[PDB]
From a paper:
The PH domain-containing protein Slm1 from budding yeast Saccharomyces cerevisiae is required for actin cytoskeleton polarization and cell growth. We have previously reported that in vitro, the Slm1-PH domain (Slm1-PH) interacts with liposomes containing PtdIns(4,5)P2 and DHS-1P cooperatively. The core of each monomer consists of seven antiparallel β-strands with a C-terminal amphipathic α-helix connected via a long and flexible loop.
The results presented here include: (i) the apo structure of Slm1-PH that we resolved at 1.76 Å resolution; (ii) one structure with phosphoserine at 1.68 Å resolution; and (iii) two structures of Slm1-PH in complex with Ins(4)P at 1.4 and 1.8 Å resolution. In both cases, the oxygen atoms of the inositol ring contact the β1-β2 region through the hydroxyl group of Tyr485 (hydrogen bond length  = 2.8 Å) and the NH2 group of Arg478 (hydrogen bond length  = 2.5 Å), and the β5-β6 loop through the ε-amino group of Lys542 (hydrogen bond length  = 2.7 Å). In addition, we observed a contact with the ε-amino group of Lys562 (hydrogen bond length  = 3.2 Å) from the β6-β7 strand. In the first case, the main-chain nitrogen of Tyr485 and the carbonyl oxygen of Ser484 (hydrogen bond lengths  = 3.0 and 3.1 Å, respectively) of the β1-β2 loop region interact with P4, whereas in the other structure the main-chain nitrogen atom of Ser539 of the β5-β6 loop forms hydrogen bonds of 2.6 Å with the oxygen atom of P4. Also in Slm1-PH, the most conserved positively charged residue within the β1-β2 loop (Arg478) is flipped towards the non-canonical binding site to interact with the Ins(4)P molecule.
Author numbering:
A (entry chain B), D (entry chain A): 465 to 529, 539 to 581
B (entry chain D): 466 to 528, 539 to 581
C (entry chain C): 467 to 530, 539 to 581
The structure:
Amino acid sequence: HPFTEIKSGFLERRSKFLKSYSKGYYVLTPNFLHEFKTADRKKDLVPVMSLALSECTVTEHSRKNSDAKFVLHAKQNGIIRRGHNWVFKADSYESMMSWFDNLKILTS
Amino acid sequence: PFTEIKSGFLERRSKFLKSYSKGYYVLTPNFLHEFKTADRKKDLVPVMSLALSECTVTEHSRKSDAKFVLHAKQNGIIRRGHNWVFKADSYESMMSWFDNLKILTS
Amino acid sequence: FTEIKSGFLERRSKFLKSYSKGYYVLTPNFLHEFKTADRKKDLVPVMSLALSECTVTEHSRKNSSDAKFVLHAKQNGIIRRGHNWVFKADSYESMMSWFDNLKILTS
Amino acid sequence: HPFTEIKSGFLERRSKFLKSYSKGYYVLTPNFLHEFKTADRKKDLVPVMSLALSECTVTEHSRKNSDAKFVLHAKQNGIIRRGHNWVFKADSYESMMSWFDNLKILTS
Ligand SMILES: O=P(O)(O)O[C@H]1[C@H](O)[C@@H](O)[C@H](O)[C@H](O)[C@@H]1O
Ligand SMILES: O=P(O)(O)O[C@H]1[C@H](O)[C@@H](O)[C@H](O)[C@H](O)[C@@H]1O
Ligand SMILES: O=P(O)(O)O[C@H]1[C@H](O)[C@@H](O)[C@H](O)[C@H](O)[C@@H]1O
């Protein structure tokens, strides 16, 4: 089961409506940030959602001392309404910055 | 910064309805994605994404002579063991889809 | 081919005070130079400049050549640490496309 | 120092002329298989060579039970002469197959 993954791992996404974080298993490719319900990379291969990097940017992130959050901004209507913003939370500042920087270089 | 192998329109047959429906498909190293349209800037959410690691391509038309079969090895979008039939515009176009899919799903 | 931008740029030599032209391909990781734009037959970069080791500092203001920008080396690679290479595009508008992408990539 | 890495790790490349293996640190992106002298991802960033995937294929590999080798074939003149073949050796069959399958899906 090869896969052109640039980064993978669990992230929590804040829901503005549910007022809580939903954890998923995320996989970054050159085209999409995909969410899967689980990390079973051999069997769980229908994405919950696929966010097109061509129309997303990463804007802000936590300053080191949770300090492990970043914002993904939508430039066009898709999974996210144009102009709207999703907040992600990683395990640590360092992990967050790995996600942030990898996303940044694919969304310039 | 895209990474796509092939893109274009395909018709997918319904086994039960015995009819074809058309979509815009994008083949990447990981998925066969279907979109409603070819507008990569405004049509951003795949109708479905078929994981290649769970599929094989089995047969195709000989020189419509533009069909090929995608077989599901595991449950996903397609039930395990089932088969979806796609139709391109020409034999030559179909063979481009097939030859890439064959390598990707080996 | 996963690329952000491609096109011809002229690179100035500090000491020779002249420009030389190449075909550049900007990816998330590198600014690559090739001799030509033939991506099927010209396969080996003349040089590959790692973006994580660079920053872009200044660029020309619009004339209203206004098409230059500066790439600064933060570490020793193709360019010695602390040194600067100057590139020239065909227009201010083209230059700003290069600069704006580079600014984001090298932040 | 973010980087669009699909896979990275040490490989040994056989030299037909030196009659020996040369070890390098390899990084696979969607565009190239790069070799670096070392794994210092923060400082060693001039590739020793960059092999364009658009004109390479992977042809054969070892059968399990060294059984950790694969062949990279050149379709065009570049680092390798058109029609010529380079042999790589990984640490294990499993590692080799990870390299082989990741290369295969980027070179169809
Ligand atoms: O959206 P909810 O209600 O889940 O709020 C939380 C946050 O979004 C965090 O920044 C934060 O670190 C918190 O733990 C806080 O609970
Ligand atoms: O071409 P050289 O001389 O480098 O020979 C080697 C091999 O090609 C390997 O299969 C093998 O596992 C060996 O290590 C052997 O040295
Ligand atoms: O430039 P060097 O030789 O240091 O190569 C490294 C990389 O540039 C990384 O993407 C990567 O994740 C590596 O760790 C790899 O060592």
